[PDB]
């Protein structure tokens, strides 16, 4: 089992326990890289209202690792939780936060009724737009009035509101293409043994075979090579 010897820990606490989340219309996108990602903490945590994975099973996230992980962090209304998924439509899915229908990753959300609610109108969503958003996009002549509407609308979040309570949602987008990994789980690497049949794991890529010295000129950005069968 071989992983890059990274001792840095991934700053998930700075995403999930952040002082403030951004508005859904202007969601934050934090890059996670060059670190050890312990996903058992997030998965085991009972504080989450939902932890739905569309990409991979949540318990495999510690064996598997990624070229990068992005954390999309924003506040939504509780009834809008259902819109944050591949294949969904709706005011948020179409005008504020669009996911690829082939999205790989996990959507994690929890109630913030005891944290953000006041009325707290500091969270805006897009009420009007001319067309739908592209995946991961971050979006009457000067005179507003009838049929001339201001595009953003706040959420009146109050402690007395479940579907109308504020929710904090973090979407973890995983790029798992066979390329150099920078975000890997809490796995202890061992020594590599050559010219013998072994069960190997290279950055989450597994198989059985004999590892030998080679003269293959991999380019600086090439982590893996492939056969005709697309096998390693």
């Amino acid at each position, epitope marked *: 089992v071989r992983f890059p010897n990274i001792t840095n820990l991934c700053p998930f606490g700075e995403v999930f326990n952040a002082t403030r989340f951004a508005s859904v219309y202007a969601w934050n996108r934090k890059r996670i890289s060059n670190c050890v990602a312990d996903y058992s903490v997030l998965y085991n945590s009972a504080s989450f209202s939902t932890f739905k994975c569309y990409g991979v099973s949540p318990t495999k996230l510690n064996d598997l690792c990624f070229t990068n992980v992005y954390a999309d962090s924003f506040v939504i209304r509780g009834d809008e939780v259902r819109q944050i998924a591949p294949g969904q439509t709706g005011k948020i899915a179409d005008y504020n936060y669009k996911l690829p229908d082939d999205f790989t990753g996990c959507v994690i959300a929890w109630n913030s009724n005891n944290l953000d609610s006041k009325g707290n109108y500091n969270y805006l969503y897009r009420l009007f737009r001319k067309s739908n958003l592209k995946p991961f996009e971050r979006d009457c002549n000067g005179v507003e*009035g009838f049929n001339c509407y201001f595009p953003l609308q706040s959420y009146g979040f109050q402690p007395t509101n479940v579907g109308y309570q504020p929710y904090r949602v973090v979407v973890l987008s995983f790029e798992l293409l066979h390329a150099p990994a920078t975000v890997c789980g809490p796995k202890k690497s061992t020594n590599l043994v050559k010219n013998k049949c072994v069960n190997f794991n290279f950055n989450g890529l597994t198989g059985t075979g004999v590892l030998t010295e080679s003269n293959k000129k991999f380019l600086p950005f090439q982590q893996f090579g492939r056969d005709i069968a697309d096998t390693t």
Partner: antibody
Amino acid sequence: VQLVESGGDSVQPGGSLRLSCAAAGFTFSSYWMNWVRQAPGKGLEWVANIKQDGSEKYYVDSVKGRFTISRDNAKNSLYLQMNSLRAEDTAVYYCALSSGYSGYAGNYWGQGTLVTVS
Amino acid sequence: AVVTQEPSLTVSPGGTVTLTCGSSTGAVTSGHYPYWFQQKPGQAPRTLIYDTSNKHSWTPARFSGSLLGGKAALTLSGARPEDEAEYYCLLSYSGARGVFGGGTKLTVL
């Protein structure tokens, strides 16, 4: 969006005064143009309006026959002329831009021009 | 051409407000396309609500252009000191000859 009204001054009762409003930053001939007046220490009084193309004019009954509105769409401005101006009519006149459904009430407001009659 | 309002309301910081307005005849409905304005000392009136319930971009979302029992209203979900102002209502009638109410003064305790 800016509405700049003027023409307010110290005038004598029984005379007349022409007030005006210039539009800036937006199209004049696409909106209704309102006038509202406020006597110091009092609430707002609706005074007059005019339709987008000038084909129709509206007045509060209390100024009917005394107030006239005309406009020049090439200058992006309108004029309110009040005749037989009363001593009691001391108020700030405001220009307001009505972009709502019916055009009867303004959404954008100017700063106001003070008319004092003595 | 008669419109009336509650002369004044007092609200504690964070408390709600129910400013009211209505005509002497019939009832207030969306057909009156009601407007509400806010005026702070030294300032021109600023429209907050238009055409019954549409809120302007410059209006804090704490304000809500709701209707009551045949009356117009401007309510607050939690008043702040910054909201001390006189408020005015305006209703349409048989045509574009609107009538203002007496004004409702809102202060914060």
